[PDB]
């Protein structure tokens, strides 16, 4: 469970996912990568599912990198509560993925499982994923 | 001082030939002997500090200025604005007098003056001497502070190289092991 | 509110002409400054007045 | 009007008890950038200087 | 930590900044600079940034560094200023304490028709 150790402000304004790709746009640690095609809010819970999926379908020597991190939190008012009396309490942490950010990358194992591994990682996530390779 | 004139002639000649020094003032020159016998007991037994000053006075001939800490510490009961430590800086004629009096009178009275050197230069050419006890200094009567302490006599030089500082020390015959 | 104010009166015409502040807890001794007086039209000692 | 001197005073420009810049003579105001990396701002009142 | 000249420059920067901040009547500025050997003097004008009058130990051909020749230097510079028709001056040192040679130069300048 990826989680920030501490934050200065518990309840910050939400960060928009509309726009192009600011950083984490090109595979730079591995050489195959899972790029996004639709900006959306994906939470820290989805990261472990995608990471666990990759790890379960990995081998004994494959290596993986997680680029995005759920820095920003979001709140949720308790049920049956009318609006007012302050902001709700933070409930879950989401990483902001914009269209074009490389989320997961893999290297150091043959071609077929890596394509399959990235596929299973992207089926656990709501965004529409796509496979890309590293420029020589 | 006659020995000051001896310093003049000897330091000039020996150092210049020893390193082919192109100028007479290329030879190293000693600047200031700071003495700092400081104690935090002035935080509680302030009287003690007062007596200290007079002894320091009696040691150098310059009255010591009491120094104050630039911070505050609870474990040492320290707080800013208090006087913990005296420092004296001798120059001109008085500085060479005190140095000569130390090396010739005070130091060989030390219980076991075996010396410490090579492992004392600060990397900039300085030198610190950590005295352990005050009674050994001749210019001190048996009546003194209820607690006995040492001293932190230090040295300065015109040069910045520690090796050349050692050369001045050897030329001055400051008595340390091999240095 | 707290009352740290005090009144300063001349020592020649014994008139109170100024209002300033003073901490009775910290400063125990009465103020004895010298300021301009409208009546005497000169500088003169002004002391604290109850 | 500012809280802390964001614009330095120049010639014919004064300062107050609230770091407020006010003029000292007739003229046209004019801003000039100065200081390290041109990060300091300076204001001045260039006198009419009609001088016939 | 530094050398004497740098501290004098530091004091010199302070004095020039204060004068340029407060000199509202655009008076001529009589800067005296004292060295180990000699002491010189120049009357700048911070509005035009040029030198109108000058005087120095080098100009007067004296073995200077004494309070005696400081009086002569002050008389010459004050004579030159009067011919230039400027009498409202501000007197600042090169960054040295106003005393000895500087005080003698200033008093000599005041007694020769200057207003400062």
């Amino acid at each position: 469970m990826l989680q920030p150790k501490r934050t200065k402000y518990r309840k910050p304004h939400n960060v928009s996912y509309e726009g192009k790709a600011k950083g984490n746009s090109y595979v730079a640690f591995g050489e195959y990568g899972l790029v996004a095609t639709k900006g959306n809010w994906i939470d820290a819970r989805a990261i472990e599912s995608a990471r666990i999926a990759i790890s379960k379908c990995l081998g004994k020597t494959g290596k993986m990198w997680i680029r995005i991190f759920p820095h920003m939190s979001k709140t949720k008012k308790p049920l049956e509560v009318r609006m007012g009396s302050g902001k709700g309490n933070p409930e879950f942490w989401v990483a902001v993925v914009k269209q074009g950010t490389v989320m997961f990358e893999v290297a150091n194992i043959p071609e077929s499982q890596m394509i399959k591994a990235l596929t299973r990682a992207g089926h656990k996530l709501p965004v529409t994923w796509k496979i890309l390779k590293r420029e020589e | 001082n006659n020995l000051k004139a001896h310093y003049q002639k000897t330091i000039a000649k020996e150092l210049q030939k020893s390193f082919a020094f192109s100028s007479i003032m290329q030879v190293p020159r000693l600047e200031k002997i700071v003495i700092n016998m400081g104690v935090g007991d002035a935080i509680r037994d302030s009287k003690f500090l007062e007596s200290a000053l007079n002894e320091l006075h009696l040691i150098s001939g310059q009255k010591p200025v009491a120094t104050k800490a630039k911070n505050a510490i609870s474990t040492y009961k320290l707080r800013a604005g208090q006087l913990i430590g005296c420092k004296v800086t001798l120059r001109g004629e008085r500085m060479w007098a005190f140095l000569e009096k130390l090396i010739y009178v005070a130091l060989p009275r030390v219980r076991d003056f075996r010396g410490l050197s090579l492992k004392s230069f600060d990397g900039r050419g300085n030198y610190t001497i950590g005295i352990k006890e005050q009674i050994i200094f001749p210019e001190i009567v048996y009546d003194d502070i209820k607690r006995i302490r040492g001293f932190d006599v230090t040295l300065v030089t015109s040069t910045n190289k520690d090796s050349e500082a050692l050369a001045l020390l050897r030329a001055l015959n400051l008595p340390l092991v091999k240095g | 509110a707290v009352k740290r104010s005090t009144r300063l009166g001349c020592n020649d015409c014994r008139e109170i002409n100024y209002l300033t502040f003073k901490n009775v807890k910290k400063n125990p001794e009465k103020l004895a400054l010298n300021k301009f007086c409208s009546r005497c039209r000169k500088v003169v000692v002004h002391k604290e007045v109850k | 009007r500012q809280r802390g001197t964001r614009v330095y005073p120049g010639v014919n420009v004064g300062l107050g008890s609230d770091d407020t810049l006010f003029a000292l003579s007739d003229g046209l105001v004019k801003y000039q950038k100065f200081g390290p990396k041109q990060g300091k701002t300076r204001v001045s009142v260039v006198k009419h200087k009609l001088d016939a | 930590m530094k050398t004497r000249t740098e501290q004098r420059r530091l004091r010199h920067k302070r004095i020039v900044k204060k004068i340029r901040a407060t000199n509202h009547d655009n008076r001529v500025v009589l800067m005296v600079i004292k060295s180990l050997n000699h002491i010189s003097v120049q009357a700048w004008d911070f509005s035009q940034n040029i030198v109108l009058a000058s005087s120095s130990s080098l100009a007067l051909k004296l073995k200077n560094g004494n309070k005696d020749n400081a009086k002569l230097v002050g008389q010459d510079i004050a004579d030159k200023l009067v011919k230039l028709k400027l009498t409202n001056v501000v007197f600042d040192t090169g960054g040295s304490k106003y005393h000895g040679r500087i005080a003698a130069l200033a008093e000599a300048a005041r007694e020769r028709g200057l207003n400062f």
């Binding site: - | 001939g61 008085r94 010739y104 009178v105 130091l107 009275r109 003056f113 | - | - | -």
Partner: protein, 46 residues
């Protein structure tokens, strides 16, 4: 600086074995204070 109550007066110092009358400024009695171990009376120096 000056105007002090503790005057630094040039006192001479003798020692046993080697006389070695070292004259040094100090604020003590203006007489021959005898030192028992001087510099020359030390195994380290010689």
């Amino acid at each position: 600086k000056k105007d002090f109550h503790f005057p630094s007066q040039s006192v001479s110092f003798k020692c046993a074995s080697c006389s070695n009358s070292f004259t040094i400024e100090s604020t003590l009695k203006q007489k021959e204070i005898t030192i028992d171990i001087c510099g020359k009376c030390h195994p380290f120096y010689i």
